[PDB]
Scaffold this active site. Sequence first.
Site, PDB file in Angstrom:
ATOM      1  N   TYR A  31      32.552 -36.445  -6.470  1.00 43.28           N
ATOM      2  CA  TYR A  31      32.249 -36.775  -5.131  1.00 43.28           C
ATOM      3  C   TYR A  31      32.635 -38.244  -5.006  1.00 43.28           C
ATOM      4  O   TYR A  31      32.665 -39.098  -5.971  1.00 43.28           O
ATOM      5  CB  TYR A  31      30.674 -36.535  -4.430  1.00 43.28           C
ATOM      6  CG  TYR A  31      29.843 -37.627  -5.238  1.00 43.28           C
ATOM      7  CD1 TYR A  31      29.188 -37.243  -6.633  1.00 43.28           C
ATOM      8  CD2 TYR A  31      29.653 -38.716  -4.673  1.00 43.28           C
ATOM      9  CE1 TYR A  31      28.439 -38.021  -7.223  1.00 43.28           C
ATOM     10  CE2 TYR A  31      28.622 -39.636  -5.109  1.00 43.28           C
ATOM     11  CZ  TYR A  31      27.810 -39.459  -6.489  1.00 43.28           C
ATOM     12  OH  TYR A  31      27.093 -40.145  -7.093  1.00 43.28           O
ATOM     13  N   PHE A  90      31.097 -46.383  -1.018  1.00 49.96           N
ATOM     14  CA  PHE A  90      29.835 -47.157  -1.726  1.00 49.96           C
ATOM     15  C   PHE A  90      29.588 -46.373  -2.929  1.00 49.96           C
ATOM     16  O   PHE A  90      28.718 -46.604  -3.690  1.00 49.96           O
ATOM     17  CB  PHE A  90      28.476 -46.830  -0.616  1.00 49.96           C
ATOM     18  CG  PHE A  90      28.324 -45.466  -0.409  1.00 49.96           C
ATOM     19  CD1 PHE A  90      27.259 -44.695  -1.195  1.00 49.96           C
ATOM     20  CD2 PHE A  90      28.575 -45.092   0.947  1.00 49.96           C
ATOM     21  CE1 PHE A  90      27.129 -43.195  -0.751  1.00 49.96           C
ATOM     22  CE2 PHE A  90      28.434 -43.774   1.317  1.00 49.96           C
ATOM     23  CZ  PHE A  90      27.686 -42.999   0.434  1.00 49.96           C
ATOM     24  N   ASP A  91      30.059 -45.265  -3.216  1.00 48.98           N
ATOM     25  CA  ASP A  91      29.915 -44.392  -4.419  1.00 48.98           C
ATOM     26  C   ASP A  91      30.961 -43.384  -4.634  1.00 48.98           C
ATOM     27  O   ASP A  91      31.679 -43.021  -3.804  1.00 48.98           O
ATOM     28  CB  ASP A  91      28.516 -43.591  -4.295  1.00 48.98           C
ATOM     29  CG  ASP A  91      28.065 -43.178  -5.528  1.00 48.98           C
ATOM     30  OD1 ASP A  91      28.814 -43.213  -6.566  1.00 48.98           O
ATOM     31  OD2 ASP A  91      27.026 -42.261  -5.543  1.00 48.98           O
ATOM     32  N   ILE A 139      20.132 -35.460  -1.107  1.00 50.62           N
ATOM     33  CA  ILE A 139      19.649 -35.265   0.580  1.00 50.62           C
ATOM     34  C   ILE A 139      19.899 -33.915   1.114  1.00 50.62           C
ATOM     35  O   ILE A 139      20.590 -33.047   0.528  1.00 50.62           O
ATOM     36  CB  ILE A 139      20.589 -36.441   0.995  1.00 50.62           C
ATOM     37  CG1 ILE A 139      22.016 -36.400   0.943  1.00 50.62           C
ATOM     38  CG2 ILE A 139      19.718 -37.857   0.638  1.00 50.62           C
ATOM     39  CD1 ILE A 139      22.707 -37.094   2.021  1.00 50.62           C
ATOM     40  N   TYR A 172      19.511 -40.889   4.362  1.00 50.08           N
ATOM     41  CA  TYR A 172      18.553 -41.647   4.058  1.00 50.08           C
ATOM     42  C   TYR A 172      17.652 -42.066   5.477  1.00 50.08           C
ATOM     43  O   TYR A 172      16.812 -42.431   5.343  1.00 50.08           O
ATOM     44  CB  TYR A 172      19.019 -42.936   3.188  1.00 50.08           C
ATOM     45  CG  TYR A 172      19.347 -42.357   1.789  1.00 50.08           C
ATOM     46  CD1 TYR A 172      18.542 -42.237   0.854  1.00 50.08           C
ATOM     47  CD2 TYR A 172      20.947 -42.337   1.609  1.00 50.08           C
ATOM     48  CE1 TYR A 172      18.889 -41.914  -0.384  1.00 50.08           C
ATOM     49  CE2 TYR A 172      21.307 -42.012   0.297  1.00 50.08           C
ATOM     50  CZ  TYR A 172      20.284 -41.649  -0.578  1.00 50.08           C
ATOM     51  OH  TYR A 172      20.700 -41.377  -2.028  1.00 50.08           O
ATOM     52  N   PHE A 231      31.645 -37.779   2.693  1.00 51.90           N
ATOM     53  CA  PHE A 231      31.682 -37.552   1.322  1.00 51.90           C
ATOM     54  C   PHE A 231      32.919 -36.607   1.145  1.00 51.90           C
ATOM     55  O   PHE A 231      33.143 -35.637   1.932  1.00 51.90           O
ATOM     56  CB  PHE A 231      30.397 -36.888   0.834  1.00 51.90           C
ATOM     57  CG  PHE A 231      29.310 -37.596   0.568  1.00 51.90           C
ATOM     58  CD1 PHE A 231      29.198 -38.646  -0.153  1.00 51.90           C
ATOM     59  CD2 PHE A 231      28.443 -37.881   1.659  1.00 51.90           C
ATOM     60  CE1 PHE A 231      28.148 -39.666  -0.237  1.00 51.90           C
ATOM     61  CE2 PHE A 231      27.235 -38.654   1.534  1.00 51.90           C
ATOM     62  CZ  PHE A 231      27.186 -39.562   0.628  1.00 51.90           C
TER      63      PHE A 231
END
EC number: 5.2.1.8
Lengths: 48, 107, 49
Positions: free
Chosen positions: B26, B36-37, B56, B82, B99
């Site tokens: 991912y 961010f990831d 999540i 979140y 994502f």
Amino acid sequence: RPVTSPGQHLLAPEDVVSCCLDLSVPSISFRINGCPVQGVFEAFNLDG
Amino acid sequence: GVQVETISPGDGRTFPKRGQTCVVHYTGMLEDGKKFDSSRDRNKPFKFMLGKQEVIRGWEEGVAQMSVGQRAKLTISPDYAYGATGHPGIIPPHATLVFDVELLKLE
Amino acid sequence: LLLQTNLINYVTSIRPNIFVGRAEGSTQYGKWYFEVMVDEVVPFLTAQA
């Protein structure tokens, strides 16, 4: 900008992209594996 | 809300089931386009079990719709994500998440 | 505010030496067609697609 075609997928092997340019309109059109791409560029500059 | 769009197709038959571990690669971006990831930077696939609530709500449901070998874009609203408190430092409050997920296999 | 860092692939562009345009009095045809066939594509050779 997302565009709708049959069997949407990022360009893969055994894929043919047909690009057509008509300078009169002006317009640029695409077909993926013989299927229309439901989007067009138009009304762009012709300075070159 | 989870919103899934197929970047690349999978097999189209094999879908995750509860109690079945999903292995993914991912890449995470905010709606503005900031990343961010990414599991590929770590070079390690991310594994999670369905129904367990490790990940999540958005991941749960979206990967539930995916197929083995399928690549998809998942858009998740804050309420599945979140949410208001956010992820401090990483994710702001009330942030929609984008994502890019490849479902490698099920184990 | 702070400067951001990430790793990105290099990207290059290749063209044929075909140049078409439109001008008043031009000797040049407006409508044109070409095709591109994909033979091999690695989705993730690196972390970036």
